[PDB]
Amino acid sequence: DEDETTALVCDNGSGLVKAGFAGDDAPRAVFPSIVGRPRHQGVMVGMGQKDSYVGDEAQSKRGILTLKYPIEHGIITNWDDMEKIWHHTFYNELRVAPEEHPTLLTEAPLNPKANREKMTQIMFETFNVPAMYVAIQAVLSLYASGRTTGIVLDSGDGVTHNVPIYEGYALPHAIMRLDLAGRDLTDYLMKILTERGYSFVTTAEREIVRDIKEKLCYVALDFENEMATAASSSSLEKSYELPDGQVITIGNERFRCPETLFQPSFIGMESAGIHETTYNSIMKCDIDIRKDLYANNVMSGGTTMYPGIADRMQKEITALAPSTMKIKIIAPPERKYSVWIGGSILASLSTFQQMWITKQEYDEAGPSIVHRKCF
Amino acid sequence: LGARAKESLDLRAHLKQVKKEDTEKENREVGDWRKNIDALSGMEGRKKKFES
Ligand SMILES: Nc1ncnc2c1ncn2[C@@H]1O[C@H](COP(=O)(O)OP(=O)(O)O)[C@@H](O)[C@H]1O
Numbered sequence A: 001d002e003d004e005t006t007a008l009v010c011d012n013g014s015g016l017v018k019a020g021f022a023g024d025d026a027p028r029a030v031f032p033s034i035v036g037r038p039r040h041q042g043v044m045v046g047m048g049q050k051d052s053y054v055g056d057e058a059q060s061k062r063g064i065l066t067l068k069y070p071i072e073h074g075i076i077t078n079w080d081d082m083e084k085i086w087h088h089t090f091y092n093e094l095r096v097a098p099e100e101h102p103t104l105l106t107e108a109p110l111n112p113k114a115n116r117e118k119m120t121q122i123m124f125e126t127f128n129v130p131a132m133y134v135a136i137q138a139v140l141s142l143y144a145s146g147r148t149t150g151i152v153l154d155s156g157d158g159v160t161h162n163v164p165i166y167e168g169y170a171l172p173h174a175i176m177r178l179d180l181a182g183r184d185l186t187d188y189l190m191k192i193l194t195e196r197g198y199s200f201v202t203t204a205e206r207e208i209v210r211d212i213k214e215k216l217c218y219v220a221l222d223f224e225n226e227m228a229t230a231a232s233s234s235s236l237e238k239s240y241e242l243p244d245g246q247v248i249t250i251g252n253e254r255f256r257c258p259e260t261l262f263q264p265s266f267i268g269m270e271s272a273g274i275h276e277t278t279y280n281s282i283m284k285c286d287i288d289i290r291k292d293l294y295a296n297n298v299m300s301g302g303t304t305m306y307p308g309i310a311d312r313m314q315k316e317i318t319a320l321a322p323s324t325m326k327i328k329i330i331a332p333p334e335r336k337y338s339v340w341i342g343g344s345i346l347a348s349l350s351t352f353q354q355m356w357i358t359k360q361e362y363d364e365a366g367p368s369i370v371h372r373k374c375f
Numbered sequence B: 001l002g003a004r005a006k007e008s009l010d011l012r013a014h015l016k017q018v019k020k021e022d023t024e025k026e027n028r029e030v031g032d033w034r035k036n037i038d039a040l041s042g043m044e045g046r047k048k049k050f051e052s
């Protein structure tokens, strides 16, 4: 722990938890949001026999644990799970006590207000954090980009959000949430791999196939033409070496998996591709600034490490929108940490401690005070 | 008649000349100056601040 009473910066992103100290450039403890529990009961002795398993421990113990998600698309299952994982993060991973450091947290866009009131109340009772602040990840990604104008595409693991912000002001009237995310990607890839001869249901193979998505997946420039040329495609077809050692070969599926977000009719969504959701979002607001939105679009999330989103994005928007002004996307490398960086940025300036949510305000007005203290 | 015409046109020319005097005083110092954006290529990439 630093000698100074600097604040805690924790991004509880929908899919990854990244925690550390204020003034740091990158979060120190970063782990996926999976939680493992003992698949069977206790009869043995001498070691183990522990209920909750979180972090890399559960990653190593994936096979003998039922792998469960305490949060999915924002919905909260069991607050005890968050209690334990935050205990682990603060003491076993961050080696910090929350008594002496206020916490800045980031929440998924348009999270329930009742969810905020319950989570804040359990937090304040269970923990002894001196002060509090929670913010939407959209403005955090904006801060990471450091440009007040643009539309943020936050692609988490449970929801994809499109949020327009012009000159550093939120536009909730033109903000939308789409239920397509990593979960859907894994599902669709699971069914295609089932049609390829490999049919698995458990979560270990879920992580294997999301790793495959991280490594080999394409974003098709032209879809049906690329499957037509991918009929044989000995060179274009790509293989992976699974940890057991078998060589699993995939061809068109590499670019037929992310395409589903762009083409939701593959597995039955009324909503069109996410580019249509950015398009409608843009026109909902006044006409004039729309060009700037076209030229200032930002994309954020862990998924963004994949190739192909930028070219597809620009080409389709230019197809939909007039091609007079030039559209260009901006995306700094390793932007999944960017939100946490913005949290540090929030703690950088000396005005931030004017609106810390202190203990006594919550003791006076209950959780309801946040309704007036954040917004 | 010539006297009437001279008087009218002289008054008109007097108002015209008083109007010219203002333009004679200044003609360019009313416009703003140039500050177009250009060059800056030599600036570095890792900004001393994190808005990089
Ligand atoms: N290094 C990486 N390369 C590619 N994809 C990644 C990487 N790390 C994480 N991801 C993907 O990002 C997803 C998690 O998104 P996340 O960054 O938590 O969203 P948010 O920005 O809302 O927190 C995971 O499902 C995973 O598939």
Ligand SMILES: [Mg+2]
Pocket (backbone or CB within 6 Å): A013, A154, A155, A156, A157, A300, A301, A302
């Ligand atoms: Mg995200």
